[PDB]
Amino acid sequence: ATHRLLLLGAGESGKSTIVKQMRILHVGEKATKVQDIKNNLKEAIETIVAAMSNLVPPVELANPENQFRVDYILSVMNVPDFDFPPEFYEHAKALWEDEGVRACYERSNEYQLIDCAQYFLDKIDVIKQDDYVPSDQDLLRCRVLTSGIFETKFQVDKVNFHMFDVGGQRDERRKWIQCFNDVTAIIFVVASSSYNMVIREDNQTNRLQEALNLFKSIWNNRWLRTISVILFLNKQDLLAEKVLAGKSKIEDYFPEFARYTTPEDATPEPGEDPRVTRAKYFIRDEFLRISTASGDGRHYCYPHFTCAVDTENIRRVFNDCRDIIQRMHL
Amino acid sequence: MMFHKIYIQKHDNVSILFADIEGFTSLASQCTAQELVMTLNELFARFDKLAAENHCLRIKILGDCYYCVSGLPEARADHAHCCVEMGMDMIEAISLVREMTGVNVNMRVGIHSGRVHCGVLGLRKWQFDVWSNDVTLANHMEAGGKAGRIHITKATLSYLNGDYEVEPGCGGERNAYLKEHSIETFLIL
Amino acid sequence: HQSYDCVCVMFASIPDFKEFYTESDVNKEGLECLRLLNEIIADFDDLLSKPKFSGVEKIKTIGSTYMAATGLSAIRQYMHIGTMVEFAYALVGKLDAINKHSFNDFKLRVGINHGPVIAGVIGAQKPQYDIWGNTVNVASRMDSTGVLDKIQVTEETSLILQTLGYTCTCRGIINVKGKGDLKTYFVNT
Ligand SMILES: CNc1ccccc1C(=O)O[C@H]1[C@@H](O)[C@H](n2cnc3c(=O)[nH]c(N)nc32)O[C@@H]1COP(=O)(O)OP(=O)(O)OP(=O)(O)O
Numbered sequence: 001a002t003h004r005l006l007l008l009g010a011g012e013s014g015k016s017t018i019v020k021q022m023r024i025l026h027v028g029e030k031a032t033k034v035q036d037i038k039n040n041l042k043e044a045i046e047t048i049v050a051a052m053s054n055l056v057p058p059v060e061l062a063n064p065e066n067q068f069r070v071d072y073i074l075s076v077m078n079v080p081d082f083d084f085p086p087e088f089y090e091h092a093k094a095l096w097e098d099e100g101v102r103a104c105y106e107r108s109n110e111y112q113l114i115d116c117a118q119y120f121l122d123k124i125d126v127i128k129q130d131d132y133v134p135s136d137q138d139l140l141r142c143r144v145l146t147s148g149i150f151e152t153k154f155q156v157d158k159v160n161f162h163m164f165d166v167g168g169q170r171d172e173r174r175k176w177i178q179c180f181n182d183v184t185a186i187i188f189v190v191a192s193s194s195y196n197m198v199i200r201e202d203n204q205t206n207r208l209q210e211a212l213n214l215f216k217s218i219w220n221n222r223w224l225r226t227i228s229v230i231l232f233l234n235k236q237d238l239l240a241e242k243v244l245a246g247k248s249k250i251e252d253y254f255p256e257f258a259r260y261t262t263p264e265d266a267t268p269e270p271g272e273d274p275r276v277t278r279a280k281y282f283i284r285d286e287f288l289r290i291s292t293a294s295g296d297g298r299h300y301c302y303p304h305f306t307c308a309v310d311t312e313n314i315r316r317v318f319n320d321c322r323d324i325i326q327r328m329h330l
Numbered sequence: 331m332m333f334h335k336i337y338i339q340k341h342d343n344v345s346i347l348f349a350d351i352e353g354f355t356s357l358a359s360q361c362t363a364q365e366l367v368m369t370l371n372e373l374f375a376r377f378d379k380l381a382a383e384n385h386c387l388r389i390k391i392l393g394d395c396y397y398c399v400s401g402l403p404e405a406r407a408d409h410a411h412c413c414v415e416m417g418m419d420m421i422e423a424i425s426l427v428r429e430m431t432g433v434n435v436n437m438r439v440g441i442h443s444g445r446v447h448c449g450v451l452g453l454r455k456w457q458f459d460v461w462s463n464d465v466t467l468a469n470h471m472e473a474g475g476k477a478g479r480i481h482i483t484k485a486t487l488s489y490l491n492g493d494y495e496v497e498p499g500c501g502g503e504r505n506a507y508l509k510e511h512s513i514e515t516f517l518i519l
Numbered sequence: 520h521q522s523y524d525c526v527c528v529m530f531a532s533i534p535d536f537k538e539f540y541t542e543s544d545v546n547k548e549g550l551e552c553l554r555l556l557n558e559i560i561a562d563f564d565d566l567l568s569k570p571k572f573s574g575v576e577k578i579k580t581i582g583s584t585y586m587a588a589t590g591l592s593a594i595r596q597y598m599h600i601g602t603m604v605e606f607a608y609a610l611v612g613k614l615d616a617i618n619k620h621s622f623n624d625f626k627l628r629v630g631i632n633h634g635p636v637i638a639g640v641i642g643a644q645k646p647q648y649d650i651w652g653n654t655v656n657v658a659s660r661m662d663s664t665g666v667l668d669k670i671q672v673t674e675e676t677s678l679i680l681q682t683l684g685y686t687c688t689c690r691g692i693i694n695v696k697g698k699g700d701l702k703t704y705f706v707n708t
C-alpha cells in the first residue's frame with residue numbers, strides 16, 4: 001500500500017530538511033554539496049557584517065583592526081564564483097571571533113539570516129580543509145532554497161511512501177495545488193522558534209503569523225476538507241534557547257501569551273523547563289484553535305513537537321505518523 | 331469528491347492537425363454576412379466527411395480554424411499518415427469551394443505528432459477538446475505555415491517512415507514560437 | 520439557423536494560464552493543471568444557473584477563454600447588455616475566489632461588444648452551436664488587447680452602458696484587423 005505525503009509550510013520551515021532525514025533513515029555524493037556548505041558559511045558571515053552598521057543602534061566591532069576584514073567580506077560579497085581562498089576562512093573566523101560581530105548575531109532576528117549560521121561558523125577550521133568531507137549532520141544543516149516540486153520515493157517495512165517537497169516561499173505556493181488531488185495526508189511544518197522574526201518576502205509579516213494564516217488557508221481549504229494534517233511544530237531546540245535566554249519575550253510579539261497558562265494534558269519531555277513547556281504548547285494550541293474551528297470531524301489534526309535536524313527525533317515522530325496513517329486507515 | 335470529477339485522459343503517440351482559411355477577412359469583406367457562414371459550413375461539411383475517411387477526428391471548429399487529430403479514439407499506430415492525408419484533402423477541398431466563393435482563398439495546414447490530454451472541461455455546454463504542449467506546437471505550426479502546403483514537425487516526420495517528399499519549412503523564421511523552441515520544420519511536397 | 524440584430528457577446532480570458540500550464544512528471548504531464556482549469560470552468564458555469572444570469576448562454580470555451588452571449592432568447596431593449604457586464608464581474612468574483620484556495624493570482628481579461636450575429640449550428644459530423652457575425656470578431660479582439668481586470672467596450676457599447684449607470688474611460692485607439700482602427704473604452708468600477 002503506497003502513500004503520498006505532501007509537506008507544506010512557509011519558507012525555511014524545514015520541509016527539505018525532513019525529506020533529508022527520510023533518506024538518512026529509509027534510503028559519496030557529498031563531494032557536490034560541499035560547495036553549498038561553503039556558500040552558507042559565506043552568506044552567514046557577510047550577512048552579519050552587513051547588518052552591523054544598518055541596525056539601530058549600530059553595532060561596533062570590539063576590534064578596530066577587524067575593520068579591514070570587514071572590508072574584505074564585503075568586497076567579495078557579490079562576487080560570482082568565489083574561490084574561497086585560504087584567507088577567507090581566516091578573516092571570516094577572525095570576525096566570528098570578534099565580540100561585536102557576535103553582538104550583532106544576537107539580534108540576527110532584526111534582519112534575514114539563515115539558521116545554520118552559528119552551526120557552520122563554529123567550524124570554519126573544518127570546512128576549509130581540502131579533505132573536508134561533510135558529515136550527515138552537515139547536510140541536515142546545509143541550506144538550499146527549493147523551487148518547484150520534487151518527489152522522494154522511499155520504502156518502510158515493505159510499504160511505499162512518496163514524499164513531496166515544495167517551495168515554502170509565497171511565489172511558490174501556486175505549485176502546491178498540483179499535488180492536492182489524491183494525497184494521503186499533509187505534513188505541515190512550522191518554525192516554532194521563528195516567532196520573533198519576519199519573512200524574507202516582505203520583511204514585515206511575522207514568520208509565525210505567516211505560518212498560521214498559511215495553516216488556516218490549508219485547513220480551511222475547499223480541496224482539503226477531508227485530508228488530515230500532521231502538524232510538525234519544528235525547531236523546538238531553537239525555540240527553547242530563545243525562551244530560556246529570555247531576550248525577546250513572547251508576550252511582546254504575541255500578547256495573548258500573557259493570559260496563557262500551561263495545559264493539563266501537557267506531557268513535558270524529561271527535564272524540561274516549565275517556561276519552555278508553557279511556550280511550546282502555546283504555539284501548538286495556537287494552531288489547534290485553527291483546526292478546532294472547522295473541519296467537522298471530516299479530517300483531523302495531529303500535532304508534533306519535532307526537530308528536523310535530529311535524525312533521532314525524526315525517526316521517532318515519523319513512526320507516530322506511520323501509525324496514524326494505518327490506525328486511521330488513511 | 332474534493333475536486334470535480336474530470337473527464338480527461340492522456341493519449342500518447344497521436345498526430346494533431348490545424349487549418350486556417352488564409353485571408354478570411356480579405357474575403358469576409360465582399361461576401362454577405364450569410365454567404366460566408368454558408369461557405370464556411372459548406373467547407374467544413376466536406377471536411378468532416380474527409381475527416382472520418384482518413385481516420386481523423388474533428389475536434390472543434392473555430393471560425394476559419396478547423397482542427398482534428400488522428401490516433402483517437404482508438405489508438406491507431408498509423409496516426410502519422412492520417413493527418414497528412416487529411417491535410418492533403420483539405421487542400422484540394424478548399425480549392426473547389428474557392429471557386430464558388432468567387433474569391434482568393436487557401437488553407438494553411440500545420441501538423442505535429444506527440445501526446446495529448448483529451449476530454450471535456452467545466453460542466454456545461456461540453457465540447458470535446460485536446461490539451462498538451464504538443465497541441466500548442468501543432469497550432470503554432472499551422473500559424474507558421476505556407477498557403478497550400480502542409481507544415482510538419484521533425485516529430486511528425488519520424489512517424490511518416492520516409493513515405494513523403496519534404497523540404498525545409500524554416501518555420502523558425504515564420505513563427506516566433508517555433509523560433510523560440512528551435513523547432514525543425516518541414517513542408518510536404 | 521436565424522440571425523439576431525442585437526446580441527451581447529463576451530470573452531473572458533485568463534492570460535496567466537498558458538504559463539501556469541506545465542507538463543512535468545510531478546503534475547501527471549499537465550493533468551493536474553487542467554484539473555485546476557476544470558475547477559475554474561466549472562465554477563464559472565455555476566453562474567449560468569443563477570436567476571440574475573438566466574439569460575446568459577455559454578457558447579463554448581476556447582483554451583482558457585470563456586465565451587458567453589446575452590440576447591439570444593429574443594426574436595430596456597439593451598438591458599441584456601448590462602447583464603453581460605454583471606456577469607463579467609461574476610466571473611471575476613469567482614476567479615479570485617479560486618485564487619484564495621490555489622495560492623494563485625489569476626486575473627481575468629474581458630471583451631464585451633454587441634450587435635448583429637448569426638446564431639446556428641455547423642459541422643456535419645457532430646453539429647455544434649455557435650454564433651457568427653463581425654460583432655463576434657470585434658468582441659474577441661476586444662479581449663486579446665484588453666487589460667487585466669478591465670472590461671473593454673466599444674463606443675456605442677460605452678454609450679449604452681452610461682445610459683445604464685456606468686462610468687467609462689477611453690483606452691485609446693486599437694487596430695481591429697478588418698475594421699481598421701477603432702476607439703475603445705474601459706469600464707470603470
Ligand atoms: C465581417 N466578418 C464576419 C462576418 C460573418 C461571420 C464571421 C465574421 C468574422 O470577422 O470572423 C472571424 C472570427 O469571428 C472567427 N472566429 C475565430 N474564432 C472563432 C470561434 O471560436 N467561434 C466563432 N463563431 N468564430 C470564430 O473567424 C474569423 C477569423 O479571424 P481570426 O482573428 O481568427 O484571423 P485568421 O483566423 O487567422 O483568419 P485571417 O483573416 O488571417 O485569415
Ligand SMILES: Nc1nc2c(ncn2[C@@H]2O[C@H](COP(=O)(O)OP(=O)(O)OP(O)(O)=S)[C@@H](O)[C@H]2O)c(=O)[nH]1
Pocket residue numbers: 009010011012013014015016017018114115116140141142143144145146166167168169234235236237238306307308309310
Ligand atoms: N537548529 C535547527 N535548524 C533546523 C531545524 N529544522 C530545520 N533547520 C535548518 O533550517 C534551515 C532551513 O531548512 P529547510 O528544510 O531548507 O526549509 P524549507 O522549508 O525546506 O524551505 P524551502 O526550501 O521551501 S524555501 C536549514 O539550514 C536547516 O538546517 C531544527 O529543528 N533546528
Ligand SMILES: C=C[C@@]1(C)CC(=O)[C@]2(O)[C@@]3(C)[C@@H](O)CCC(C)(C)[C@@H]3[C@H](O)[C@H](OC(C)=O)[C@@]2(C)O1
Pocket residue numbers: 459460461462463464465466469536537540581582583584
Ligand atoms: C489551456 C491550456 C493551453 C496551455 C493548452 C493548449 O494546448 C491550448 O488550449 C490550445 C492550443 C489547444 O487546446 C487547441 C485549441 C486552442 C484554441 C488553439 C488552444 C489555445 O491556443 C490555448 O491557449 C489559450 C490562448 O487559451 C492553449 C495554448 O492553452
Ligand SMILES: [Cl-]
Pocket residue numbers: 009010011012013189190191194207208211
Ligand atoms: Cl515557518
Ligand SMILES: [Mg+2]
Pocket residue numbers: 015016145146165166167168
Ligand atoms: Mg524546501
Ligand SMILES: [Mg+2]
Pocket residue numbers: 350351352353354394
Ligand atoms: Mg485564415
Ligand SMILES: [Mg+2]
Pocket residue numbers: 350392393394395
Ligand atoms: Mg481562426
